[PDB]
Amino acid sequence: QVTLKESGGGLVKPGGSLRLSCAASGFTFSSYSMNWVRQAPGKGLEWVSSISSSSSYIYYADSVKGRFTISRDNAKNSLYLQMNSLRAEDTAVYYCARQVGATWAFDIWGQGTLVTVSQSVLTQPPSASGTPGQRVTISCSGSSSNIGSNTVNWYQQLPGTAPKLLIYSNNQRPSGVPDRFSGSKSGTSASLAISGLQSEDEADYYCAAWDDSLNAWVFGGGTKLTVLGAAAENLYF
């Protein structure tokens, strides 16, 4: 029973401050690097910050650097995100995520907390569609400093759920993912293939890679996959 639970979200005026909290249980919190990832309503995933197991190594997304502060309390098994100089653009659902050291994959995600304050580096097709049984391949195009230098991870986000790790280290499936899902990487581009498409595969798919030039995680804009049947077309010859 591995759980992450975020708290602290709500309505805040621009220029304001909030502190988000992420409570962890069921694992050795003090031995993992942790991250904040956000999702603006109806938009893609956007990494915010990371902190190593003893707080020695901290990174920020360029847009939040100098305004946000990440911290952790290993005694209270808690992760925090202090947000200052809040902007309309900070309106999002904020997720807490655990990072696996050997791969950098985000294998456990929280449930998310909404913050309302009142373009992606990796390139994905915004939509994909297929009929059940077919094979669909989704591309993710990056550059030399990200996909060209580092492994690619893929996350599946089912409607009304938090994202889940789908593929790590380019082509590895975690425990829980069937062989119908396969990943590949060549040069500065990566692909996710879904064989034997099923109605339950209707979800958003995201590719992610560390970028050595930005010193940041870069996520794709997301591919909404639709599984559509029959189609009563009027063919006229």
Author numbering: 1 to 118, 136 to 254
Sentences copied from the publication:
Mcl-1 (myeloid cell leukaemia 1) is a member of the Bcl-2 (B-cell lymphoma 2) family of pro-survival proteins that regulate programmed cell death via apoptosis. Mcl-1 is an anti-apoptotic member of the Bcl-2 family which binds to pro-apoptotic proteins containing the BH3 domain, a short α-helical stretch of around 16 residues. Binding of Mcl-1 to the pro-apoptotic proteins prevents apoptosis. Here, we report the characterization of an antibody fragment produced in vitro against Mcl-1 which was formatted as an scFv and a Fab.
C-terminally tagged constructs incorporating a TEV cleavage site leave five residues of the TEV recognition sequence post-cleavage, whereas N-terminally tagged and cleaved constructs leave only GS at the N-terminus. Interestingly, the C-terminal tag remnant formed extensive crystal contacts in both the C2 and P21 CHO-scFv crystal forms, as well as being crucial to crystallizing the scFv complex. In the crystallization of the individual antibody fragments, the positioning of the tag on the C-terminus resulted in a tag remnant after cleavage, while no remnant is left behind when the tag is on the N-terminus. As shown by both crystal forms of the CHO-scFv this contributed to the crystal packing, and its removal with carboxypeptidase Y led to a less favourable crystal form and no crystals at all in complex with Mcl-1.
